[model samples]
Target: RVTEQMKNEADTEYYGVISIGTPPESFKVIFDTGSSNLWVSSSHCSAQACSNHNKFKPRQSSTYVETGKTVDLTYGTGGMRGILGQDTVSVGGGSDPNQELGESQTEPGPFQAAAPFDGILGLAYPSIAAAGAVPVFDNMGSQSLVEKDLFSFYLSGGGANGSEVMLGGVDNSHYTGSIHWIPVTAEKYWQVALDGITVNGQTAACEGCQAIVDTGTSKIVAPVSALANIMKDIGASENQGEMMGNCASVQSLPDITFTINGVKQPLPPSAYIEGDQAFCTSGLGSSGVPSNTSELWIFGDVFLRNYYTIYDRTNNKVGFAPAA
Candidate 1:
């Protein structure tokens, strides 16, 4: 199986390297599972964000095709405007020839300018792909570039090493115990049904919640009302816009457990708190974002750091095991 070593950035984001075009020009990208499109900054872009990062020079490649299609992606932080192109996307020594990807003409916001990674490579379903751009993983599957139509994530905590993204299959060494599979409730964002959320065995809102197991997001986001209670239960107080927690009380804090498809997944205080003993912030964030259907909760890296996640496209399910 193909595996990529991912670097953990401040325990908030994880990214890895990928190459594009013939002869391969390398770029660091986030293998995000929240959105469905792959994009990198174009050499033509004069934007500050593009200038700060590595840009894909189409001229440098022997095989590159301009599709003459524009794509505008609106993200939670900001947005990117790019054009469509087809080229070979190389991942872990495997190549997907003529894979559709975006070449950014413009990228806005401080988040983009300060990002360590060059661009994002989305892994969501085709139904949510903007501009009808087929995802790189889809092309990989079609081209038989992978051992299986699935990929797994092992996110290490505290910005430590050993984080990895395994394409095609999972590594048993990264996780312990049996993997619990949960069927996907929606094809769009690796979404699933959340049974409930509890603190000290008491329900703390989200009895029946629709959660998106998103790798793109940093924090575990819940509706404002639910987040308030969870924070209070964990002894976190509001400081500015962030929920502040006492580092001294971290071990004493109760585990915020989430029930997914009848499986109880608990995140300890150490896993749900960010920062050292000097100052700490709650890992849970408020979600003011609206969902098309029911209330949306994003189970992001904050939760994934404690669990080894597997995205199985063939089975249309997601699996979680305790990280080893």
Candidate 2:
């Protein structure tokens, strides 16, 4: 069990900046649970946004080597383009000299310019690193300084002014309540088994639906068809000519509950509201027509508000207990 610590006002979720090698190039990165690969922007990128970013200039270092494969990755919100390369990456307090890390050769999307982060450090699974590469966390766990293989995240409810991601283990001291444990399926993605969802003590009417707990995404997106059904059930009116509810209206809404592994966990009202007045509204048919895609539910910070989520890779399961 990990000891809990009170959330400091300054405790916010952020990526770490690391020095690559002897010459020391620092890169700001986001620790992502949504994806499994670790990648950084490389110096070869020609885009203007690449200029502001901390590019990985392999040629400057004698330790740099090319992997020969060009990787272009696209996300729901943005995309990135670069060539795969190998370099020594030092993370946490340990140093992995010449470890295989993704070196981005270019920038292509919103992340290319305005984004504060230069790259992503994925903590999802060990399988993400080629066929037999060492995991990032394994490097941390190998040291006696760290106690556990799991990581914990606590994202604040919008306007609540408390959100942070804890490394090594969870600091349980500051939390106010019990932590709920949710089981994760062993699959390609860290998929959580969602039995059903309820709003204000009523079950949401969606057929054949499951939710994936993605730390990478920012919003909770459901299928259009399911969302339509859910909106109808809630009797919520559109605010500001949008599908989501008004800011004032959301306060009156009841807490939501997601049932998983026979556990019914309640989510706070603040989790559903996006901004002070804007709620997260789904784009009609945006998740594919008829919402037949299995990619329907992408749980983000909204769902994370009510619980302190633990990514337990050692047992191959994720534990979610209610947050204080």
Candidate 3:
């Protein structure tokens, strides 16, 4: 397995370095599973946020090729405008030639200014890829760049230690006990079936729900009503959409358990509460949508930090175990 060392940014995001182009122009990227397009800031971009981080110089690369197509991408939090191009992408100790990627010309958002990484490398399926561009993982497999058609993520709690994303296989040392495998319900996102969510050993909400396991997001996002109850139960008050509660309540808050594929995975209070006691916040965030509409939840970094996840594209299943 080729393991890429990742840096945790304030427990909100985890990113790793990847080299593109022939001479290996390096850029820090988020190996995100929630989306399906790889994009990086280009030197051609005169956007204000583009100057804050590294930019990919396409002309400097010997093997750079362009499709002459412009693409626009919008996410739950941020967006990007870029032109499509192809180059050699090296990640997780493997390289794929002629990989389609976006040369971002404009990253118009506040999130990009504070972002530690220069770009995003999406790991989701090609079905959801913007501009009909094939995903990086698909090209890696087609080019026989990986030993196995799978990858795994091991995110460290808070900012205590380094995180990693292992391509081609799972790392046994990063997880403990046996892995509980769950089938994917959809191919768009790394989506899976959620049996239910429990608090204080009682079913609180999200019975029979669809959830996306997204490393790109930071919080455990759920429907507004469901998250409202969770916040209230944990003594958190909503302040401009942020759930802030007494730091001391971390000890008294109940553990939330998510039953997936008949396996009970519990998230303790220490795992969901953010920051110190003086300015503590609930890691559970609101999705702002109705529960009956989609019944969708997002298991982001908050859940990944507590559980090591393996995305098995070969078997079309997801495996989870306690993070070591």
TM-score for each model: 0.97, 0.79, 0.95
In model 1, which regions exceed 4 Å deviation?
Answer: none
Q: Rank the candidate models, highest TM-score first.
A: 1, 3, 2
Residue lDDT tens for model 2, 1-324: 233222322122335555675567877777667666677777777677778888777778777877777666654444666566666776544455656666666666655587667777777666544433455666665643356677787765433545556666776753666655665664444667677778777788443456666666655667665666666643455755656655556567667677777777776556554453345542222233122245457666556555677877666677776666
Ranking by lDDT: 1, 3, 2
- lDDT tens digits, residue span 163-188, model 3: 98999978888999999999889898
True-structure RMSD, every candidate: 1.3, 4.6, 1.8
* Top of the candidates by lDDT: 1
Which ranges of candidate 3 are over 4 A from the true structure?
Answer: 239-241, 288-293
Q: Which candidate is the best by TM-score?
A: 1
Candidate 2 lDDT at 200 equals 76
Error of 3 at 115 (Å): 1.2
Greater TM-score among 1 and 3 belongs to: 1
Where is model 1 poorest over a 10-residue stretch in terms of lDDT?
Answer: 223-232
- Candidate 1 residue lDDT tens string, 186-305: 899999888888886767787568889988888989976776677668788878677887787777889878888888788888887887658998878877567878788988998888
